[PDB]
């Protein structure tokens, strides 16, 4: 597959943040959603602009321990210094002694291992996290992206407590990449819509025995991700997703999955 | 593909807890189990007989906004307010897109969703909780069904921490419906028995690759269930089922699959 | 299968710990690995060495309640007695009713059920706990098994929080063993490698669909297991292995799978 290239500087932002972004002063978080193909490499020009040691650590994907991101493997990086990270994939394939090799494909993500402690212990906290989705031939594609990372007792280092809001008409194949991240156990509940617990969170067709839920348990550093059809035999509505481990919910662990008719119109909700 | 009707009551129940009935003074806690096939439509005229808005929320099932139950989206239920509640359920099939709709069937659960607070932590708290199974057509049916739910540190609201036994015959198809709420992450543990991490909790043949467990973490609104032959290459016995958190199981968090042999009698 | 014997014992250690072991005075925590083919049945001549009563019990495998290794069941063993314990293990296939019945084969566990309480926790917490591998017919055999134990805040009772080292050759097949006990849940997770979310931790070929992942949420008494072609598209290296609760990895919770080129040596 490809050789690719980007750029990515991990920036400290306003209310004491940090995040990672494409440019400098377009960082966010989560970080920017990268999205590679099986067999395709991805050489990450990383750039540490901030006052502090900080590092690209990534789950999944094919690295060497020279992009470790890691004080053990010396592949963080100085302040203000820079770094070439490179992320490889293969597709699966038999082995010569006749087992089955795993491809990369997959829900995973990336974040600092060295920001506060030798675990990125502050740095995650403080919003160096981001998506990586790895796609086999054939996967189908969706209309949208949207991540949503349960971090300790925020989504998405929001303030009160509270998630974002997605938007999407009824029909529309909509993509979620679900990131927990910190010290607590969650689980992730949407109102409306189901998903398959496999590796595209859809069924694969009938033969396909992955259970059917709308809950997942999920601790620190795992990673799924599923695609709907927004509004699937339940119509347009603002859909609730939230954390259903009941305080967090009341804490205001909660967000709207707003689905729309297709003249834009919304059943009257009261957020 | 049948279109049904039932009348459900939230209540006020003794020692401080409220329960959802089939009929007024007869709530239990957990819930009535509600059982339908894929392709069934439910409407259930729901009545808060209580003094607090009170609302039937489900997972898993496919309703409409006007079905949610939220404060949200307005259709939860005033004080001694009456409600009809509308779940669909629809049978796995190919989209336009050549992907594959998951159908409506496995293993779910409803609640409250507006006691104490927006999420229902008052309602769950104090009994508004029930099981439910969609069936898919063909699947295997179970000899008796048993409900447990792992809701903060009680099993089913029960006093003292312990469970319900539940009584079998060695060869029985015995079904558990296995649901948790409140606060709390629970590992669920059956000691004798095993079941399949999937869909029906049992392996549909040699090519299901799910992994075989006796143990499963849990997290609030988890819902399982899974079929065993009672007594399987083990025998009769009292079989503990209980949780596997050291401290819940050393706090009662505990009950008994008694499996009788053909006589009648348990060993022991 | 085959009938199998061995001897086990109970003893206490040093640092009032207690471990199961195949030879008085060389008990380990965790216990020795028992590796079983699906039809093989082990008995088990148990010898409780210590001044408390103790137990063997097991996950997975077939038992009577005979050998629960419960007081419910009246099958623990008082202070310096010996007690045989039988499991047995079946392969999968049709019942006469044409559903599947699962099979034995998995990773699974043993531990000690009586001592401090009824559930072993005192037991669990001192070191009575070790693996059990059930394997199906014509499954891949590893180079070499490593266990893995998250016992509260502690990797395999070690002190100081760490964990240990595993040392392996770039291309080897390493078997990773992964068992959870105690009062917390964790999220076990390895740099540079990745495993398959089923039975064997390794996809049967192209029509599996379950989740490749690095990173896996374990409560109390959950058990799975996966093999890794050391190094296989990463190379040679300190590869970390760590619990991924921040608290617990930021306290020592780590150890390192230590892949060596074919010539001896590792990258700084
Ligand atoms: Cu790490
Ligand atoms: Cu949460
Ligand atoms: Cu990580
Ligand atoms: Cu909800
Ligand atoms: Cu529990
Ligand atoms: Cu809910
Ligand atoms: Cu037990
Ligand atoms: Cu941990
Ligand atoms: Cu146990």
Same mark, same amino acid.
């Given at each position: 597959?490809?050789?690719?290239?980007?750029?990515?500087?991990?920036?400290?932002?306003?209310?004491?943040?940090?995040?990672?972004?494409?440019?400098?002063?377009?960082?966010?978080? &989560?970080? &920017?959603?990268?999205?590679?193909?099986?067999?395709?490499?991805?050489?990450?020009?990383?750039?540490?602009?901030?006052?502090?040691?900080?590092? %690209?650590?990534?789950?999944? %994907?094919?690295?060497?321990?020279?992009?470790?991101?890691?004080?053990?493997?010396?592949?963080?990086?100085?302040?203000?210094?820079?770094?070439?990270?490179?992320?490889?994939?293969?597709? &699966?394939?038999?082995?010569?002694?006749?087992?089955?090799?795993?491809?990369?494909?997959?829900?995973?993500?990336?974040?600092?291992?060295?920001?506060?402690?030798?675990?990125?212990?502050?740095?995650?906290?403080?919003? %160096?996290?981001?998506?990586?989705?790895?796609?086999?031939?054939?996967?189908?594609?969706?209309?949208?992206?949207?991540?949503?990372?349960?971090?300790?007792?925020?989504?998405?280092?929001?303030?009160?407590?509270?998630?974002?809001?997605?938007?999407?008409?009824?029909?529309?194949?909509?993509?979620?990449?679900?990131?927990?991240?910190?010290?607590?156990?969650?689980?992730?509940?949407?109102?409306?819509?189901?998903?398959?617990?496999?590796?595209?969170?859809?069924?694969?067709?009938?033969?396909?025995?992955?259970?059917?839920?709308?809950?997942?348990?999920?601790?620190?550093?795992?990673?799924?991700?599923?695609?709907?059809?927004?509004?699937?035999?339940?119509?347009?509505?603002?859909?609730?997703?939230?954390?259903?481990?009941?305080?967090?919910?009341?804490?205001?662990?909660?967000?709207?999955?707003?689905?729309?008719?297709?003249?834009?119109?919304?059943?009257?909700?009261?957020?």
């Amino acid at each position: 597959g490809e050789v690719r290239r980007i750029k990515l500087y991990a920036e400290r932002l306003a209310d004491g943040q940090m995040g990672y972004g494409l440019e400098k002063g377009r960082a966010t978080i &989560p970080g &920017p959603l990268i999205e590679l193909n099986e067999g395709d490499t991805l050489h990450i020009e990383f750039e540490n602009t901030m006052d502090v040691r900080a590092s %690209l650590h990534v789950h999944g %994907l094919d690295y060497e321990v020279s992009s470790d991101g890691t004080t053990l493997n010396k592949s963080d990086v100085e302040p203000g210094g820079t770094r070439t990270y490179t992320w490889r994939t293969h597709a &699966p394939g038999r082995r010569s002694d006749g087992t089955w090799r795993a491809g990369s494909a997959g829900y995973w993500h990336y974040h600092d291992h060295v920001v506060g402690t030798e675990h990125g212990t502050g740095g995650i906290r403080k919003g %160096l996290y981001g998506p990586v989705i790895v796609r086999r031939k054939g996967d189908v594609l969706p209309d949208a992206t949207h991540t949503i990372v349960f971090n300790d007792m925020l989504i998405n280092n929001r303030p009160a407590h509270s998630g974002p809001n997605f938007e999407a008409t009824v029909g529309d194949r909509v993509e979620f990449v679900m990131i927990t991240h910190g010290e607590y156990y969650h689980t992730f509940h949407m109102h409306g819509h189901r998903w398959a617990d496999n590796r595209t969170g859809m069924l694969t067709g009938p033969d396909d025995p992955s259970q059917v839920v709308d809950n997942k348990i999920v601790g620190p550093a795992d990673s799924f991700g599923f695609q709907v059809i927004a509004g699937e035999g339940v119509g347009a509505g603002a859909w609730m997703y939230h954390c259903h481990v009941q305080s967090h919910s009341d804490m205001g662990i909660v967000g709207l999955f707003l689905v729309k008719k297709t003249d834009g119109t919304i059943p009257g909700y009261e957020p």
